[PDB]
Amino acid sequence: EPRPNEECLQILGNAEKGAKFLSDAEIIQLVNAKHIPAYKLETLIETHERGVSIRRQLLSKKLSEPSSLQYLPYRDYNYSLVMGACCENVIGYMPIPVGVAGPLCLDEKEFQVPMATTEGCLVASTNRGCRAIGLGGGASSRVLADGMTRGPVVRLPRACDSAEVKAWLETSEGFAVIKEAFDSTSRFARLQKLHTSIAGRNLYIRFQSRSGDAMGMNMISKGTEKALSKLHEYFPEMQILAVSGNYCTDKKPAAINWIEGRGKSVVCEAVIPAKVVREVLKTTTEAMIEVNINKNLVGSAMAGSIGGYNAHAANIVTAIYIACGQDAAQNVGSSNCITLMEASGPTNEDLYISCTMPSIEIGTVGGGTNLLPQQACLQMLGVQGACKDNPGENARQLARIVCGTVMAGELSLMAALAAGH
Amino acid sequence: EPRPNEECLQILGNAEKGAKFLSDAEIIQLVNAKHIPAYKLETLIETHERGVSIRRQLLSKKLSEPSSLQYLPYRDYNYSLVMGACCENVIGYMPIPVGVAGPLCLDEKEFQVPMATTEGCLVASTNRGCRAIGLGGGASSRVLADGMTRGPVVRLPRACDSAEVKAWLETSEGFAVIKEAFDSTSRFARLQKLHTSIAGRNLYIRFQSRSGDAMGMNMISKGTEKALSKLHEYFPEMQILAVSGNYCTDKKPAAINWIEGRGKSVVCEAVIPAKVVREVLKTTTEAMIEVNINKNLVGSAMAGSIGGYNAHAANIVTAIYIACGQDAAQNVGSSNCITLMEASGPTNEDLYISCTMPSIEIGTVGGGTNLLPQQACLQMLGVQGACKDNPGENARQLARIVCGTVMAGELSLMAALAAGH
Amino acid sequence: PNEECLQILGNGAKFLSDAEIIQLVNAKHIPAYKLETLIETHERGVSIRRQLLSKKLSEPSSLQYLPYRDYNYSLVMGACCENVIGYMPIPVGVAGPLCLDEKEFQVPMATTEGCLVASTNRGCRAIGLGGGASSRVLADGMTRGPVVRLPRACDSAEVKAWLETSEGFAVIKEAFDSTSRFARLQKLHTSIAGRNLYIRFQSRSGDAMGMNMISKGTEKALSKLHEYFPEMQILAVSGNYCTDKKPAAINWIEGRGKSVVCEAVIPAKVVREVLKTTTEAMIEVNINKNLVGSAMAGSIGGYNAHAANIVTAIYIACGQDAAQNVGSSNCITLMEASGPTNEDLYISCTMPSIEIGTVGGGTNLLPQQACLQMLGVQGACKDNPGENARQLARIVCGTVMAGELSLMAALAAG
Amino acid sequence: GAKFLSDAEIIQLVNAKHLIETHERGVSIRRQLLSKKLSEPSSLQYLPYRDYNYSLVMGACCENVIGYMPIPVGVAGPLCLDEKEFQVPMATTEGCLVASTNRGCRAIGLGGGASSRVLADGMTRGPVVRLPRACDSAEVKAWLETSEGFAVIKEAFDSTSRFARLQKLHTSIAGRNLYIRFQSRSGDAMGMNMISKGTEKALSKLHEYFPEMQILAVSGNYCTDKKPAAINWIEGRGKSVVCEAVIPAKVVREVLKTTTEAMIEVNINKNLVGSAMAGSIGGYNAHAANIVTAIYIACGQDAAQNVGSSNCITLMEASGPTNEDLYISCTMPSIEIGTVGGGTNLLPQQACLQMLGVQGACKDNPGENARQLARIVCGTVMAGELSLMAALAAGH
């Protein structure tokens, strides 16, 4: 029943037959005889799941243990939203357990916050943090700035010519020409003041702009390319070396994100009465302030940290990001946080706590937020997709929730560290 | 239909009956108006999956769109390994697509590297980097250091006293006492050289040890508590302020991880022939070098980066980490990377490339690696679980593969930026 | 005699003798803090303070070789120094000619490090034979970065949003600007840390370095803000957000004082003969020392060989605040191939936070003015306010580059 | 020879492309030659040069010398440090700096004084080397971490000089690059030249074990010298020192014009939270660089080394029975300092070292004078932090 290569190939090349009329073993036989390249499987095979099934079968013969994929699931998942948009060479999916911490009492609302993690006690501990906030009267937050960035590097023939371009970009008329080119690429593109920096004949230019409820990499990058195209008409000796010169800065540690901000800059706060610190967090305000000063400020300082003046902000950021279809690699910068703890009240027994996070890189449209399970976690918070009547509000709201959940996480871990055990 | 709460409690307390003998609505009736909290559903209800269903039904009435969870899957997932171990208040799982990138030719072996992501083109781009490495004769790597850390902060009454504790810890006999206390807590606990730092009367002590194939936080922290307990015998006035004083440093950016290392320090390299750079990567060696210098070195420097002298190592680390059951929040430090490129060979036209990654925090036993799907990805690489013949070898191998896959990804993104998209 | 000497003080101290004034202090007829005003001449004030100090030392002949005579204390007293016991001579050597923007500078350098001046001089020579160096001032504006507290972080967020409106900034600008001729407030930069708000005021200062001028403007500016926000507390007029005399990435990224760039091309022949190395070797060492090496050491802004040496020496010679070497030494030195066959050395130095002035502070002293005069930048520039301080910043960046050329060549040659 | 000729005559021979007996006359002729190049030749007339002892400068401290620059020297003291009193010299042209430091010294005196300790001691040099492959540089790193490897490198380092005593090595790879941090004490000298000389023979010995090793540069910026760097903050360089003092509430009130509660609020939110918002590495202090710089110029130190020597974290806590007294500490992990060599060979500079009782080598215990000077810098920096922070908290 398994036919020779030549007969299998004419069926493959027959337009009203194709791969649907071949068996798995026949397509695999063609791949092993070098008649079909492995990468062509995607467009040849009719069903997305069958493409995955055959890729898995081919992969399995190459492994030192043939059954290693047995427990990697792949069936009955919606590959229609993933192929050609979210992932390639797909062999299945990786399930991450999702837990819920809440209610998180933030800006007079209540949020049930999804958290995808495999770290024991993180969800329960964050949920204790939420309790302390809820019985403490709730938290308030503000978005202080908003704008994704891209920081390309361009080269001029001399440092004198890069100084020329820099000064041209700071004149109102030169900026306006660049701004019109940038803003024409999308309805959300609103270029803010340009920040630039010279290193000899290099010039690093930092384009910042809102992006609606999208995280905005693709949008800002498309606007950046058009903006540099206009700049090249005025300076034709300029060389566009890279559309990212690491001055954005994206997915690496950098002081510029900390100081200037990137994406949403957020601040969150709360006052925890002495009673609640006692009953929920099992400690005193005094013990918490001592740990916070000497761990999160002084410890982080001795360690030579830029932007890591916090206990485990990245835990909460990472968990929410995975659950809500964010780019989890952007937790590098998005976890930037400084946690402050102060005595409040007449006897200094209440705890003022705040978290400031200047660089939360987040969105509710595009990327992994296109997928339906990820959309379910976004719907939990009432932030899924674009907001028609107030663009950016959904991404802004999700960013506030991230900072407030980070604060809940900070409360709980700092109490456990102050306690002992 | 739902009978009174009185009778329902009697049926639950009856061991021959239990929760099996109640309806979904009666379990929910008891939760609404105390008697059962919500977290006790873990241990009370007949099965794990029914507990999840009950928790989903509770959560849904709290949401402002009752159908939010519709597309968040939960049925037929193996929760036995998750409850009490990896996650709490569990309402389901989040599918993250997994693609394969390889073969990765590293140390005369081949690796089919699993990668869990939602960013379009990430897996295909890394896969191109792999082809360039494979046609170039392969990549080589070495593990330079190995030791997970914990960085407690203690205080003495005076800085003179904290100074006395530092000096005693620097004596051979003082260190030997502390090493004996640390090493008695576990078979893999083998304390390495101590690094300490003073901030007035504060003393930050960085304990470092290998940890078999486990990432090793729980073990090292246990060793740390016993060691501080022993230090207190010699210095009774010492207060342990926090078992983590942010001097480790864990899940925050810190120069000390960059300079001293944390977990596995790894270097990787490869020479890519000029022909391969032209054909596969669509660029030249001369162009790659100029972008790497001015983006990854000069660009990151202008941005104020500590440890972020690379293009997108965080993308590869994050995707391998999610796929293989690592703690994704450790991406913060694990993505630390310097990428270097230079002319090579007789013509001086071949591309030399190296990625050095001082702080890969990784493990093939514990946490998320206990789950079967992420074990399947570990098994692809041949690094699943502990290595009995050579403790630590699987975790070392996995760190080599991470640094190699990063180098692959660096080759392909850097070529794309150099060639102007 | 004791009470006879007190009688002569009631007329004066100039009539009295050294030993009698010292007798009056040791026996407690007169306290020692009163001698500053009673004694008329400044040099004799210094002399008596030295003699009173010497008896308290374990080696009373300590001050023998510390000089104090025949020096202009009238400019020092009440403006540059207190409790003055003399002065410290710092050798001044000269490196030049420095060929910068069609001019030629003889650069004074106060230092006690052997070979520093000569090495800097050899760099100037390689620059001169390469066709000279060019330079541009990219930005200019001294800063002060006060910290204010509000009752809540919602309130501080509100104040930041107010300062970001066209209407709020304009009101703060007017208050700031009324304090001084050259006080022209530029765009504000702020950061919140909870209920803290850090506000970075930045303005030109003519030819002055500008610290005391920007603080004056900052105080009056925060006074106007207080009327719009009564519950605001002014914690400290400097909240380290400036940032002054401490390492800080904000200075590296946003700049402070003069940001400057400088460049030159050194012909291959000049690299072989004057610098005793090759273009290929200079580039290899610069990449792996100043970029990769500084990166492995966790450097923010220290991507250079020894800019601090040159910055420090010029600064001491030219009456600058030498403690500002901390941030003023920020520098990145780049080297690449150039010319037909990639054999000439392109070199550039970028220094974004040179903190400098030609009026005020130690530039009001005459020896320091002489070194400023050597370079043609002493005092204020009448026709073009701030042009002298900009020129000195270009000289600093240019001399630094000469210093990077020489030292980097010596390291490459081994 | 030259004494027979006159000033105008000698200039003539230099202009015609073709030594003098006294050092002061050589300085005079250089000034006159340089005057011909300046657009205002009379600018040198108030730059002094007469009757300076140029014998210890030429061929040691400065070249092309045209004179000297007078920096005013004030005195802050007495500073009560480790049960002694120091009259601390400070060379500065910044008004109020000495008087403010002086007020900080007063405050510490009335609080029973300051105590300090030296936590570590070792100057460094951080050469960069290269190997064909990263696999080879990895091999070299591993070899340097064996006790046999370190021992042979130690023997080589230690043979170059009396005080050359090599401590643990620190290394970093960057591909085929290897950065190696050598650390040794250096008697009472700052130690740069000694540690470089030791580094040269050690690297030459390493080259025997690895003949394909290129020595790219003897300083590859891994030291790190005269540039900001986290490695100095974390590992230290030169003297790591700590200093402390408790100021009675009465003294904070009357001498410092503020409260303990107020001082703590400003210190936390300026020196910690502000420096953090500014992206600072090691700059968690108000103005340590003022004090370091002034003491350095007065005492013949390398003033360019204030970049790293200023590294300081200033901490302030509540203290005492009613929690009303002010605990203060400064911690400075990288004070680069010496009492012999460089500018400490000059007599004026030695006058200031003698005030402090730390001039020259300590014959009874080599390195104890430089250690003492570092302690004095840390204590005087703490004095300075007290006064300025009090002034800032009080509203001026």
Ligand SMILES: CC(C)n1c(C(=O)NCc2ccc(F)cc2)nc(-c2ccc(F)cc2)c1CC[C@@H](O)C[C@@H](O)CC(=O)O
């Ligand atoms: C955040 C959770 C997972 N967590 C907790 C926790 O919050 N426990 C209290 C708790 C537990 C369960 C509840 F239901 C309620 C409260 N304590 C520790 C912990 C601390 C020191 C140790 F030595 C080892 C574990 C961790 C791991 C922190 C880890 O992911 C980041 C941490 O390393 C960052 C840092 O502080 O440096």
Ligand SMILES: CC(C)n1c(C(=O)NCc2ccc(F)cc2)nc(-c2ccc(F)cc2)c1CC[C@@H](O)C[C@@H](O)CC(=O)O
């Ligand atoms: C990593 C992949 C997804 N990728 C690629 C890519 O590898 N393209 C080449 C390619 C693609 C598919 C193939 F099958 C083979 C080769 N180009 C870009 C990109 C660059 C600049 C833009 F403006 C916008 C997109 C990205 C996203 C960059 C992002 O994840 C990190 C980047 O922002 C970090 C940085 O360099 O700053």
Ligand SMILES: CC(C)n1c(C(=O)NCc2ccc(F)cc2)nc(-c2ccc(F)cc2)c1CC[C@@H](O)C[C@@H](O)CC(=O)O
């Ligand atoms: C700048 C001068 C003082 N200098 C020179 C010098 O330029 N010599 C060449 C020269 C000499 C006289 C001339 F007339 C012409 C050329 N070579 C070295 C030197 C470097 C590494 C050593 F191991 C040991 C000595 C220094 C000390 C640099 C020092 O102050 C900062 C340095 O540590 C910064 C760094 O690269 O890390």
Ligand SMILES: CC(C)n1c(C(=O)NCc2ccc(F)cc2)nc(-c2ccc(F)cc2)c1CC[C@@H](O)C[C@@H](O)CC(=O)O
């Ligand atoms: C240290 C002295 C010179 N000083 C003083 C001072 O100590 N005053 C108290 C005092 C004065 C005289 C006495 F006799 C006794 C006590 N207040 C200020 C000052 C001015 C404006 C300001 F906006 C911020 C401070 C300065 C200049 C600091 C300056 O060199 C570093 C500063 O920029 C570092 C910083 O805090 O950011």
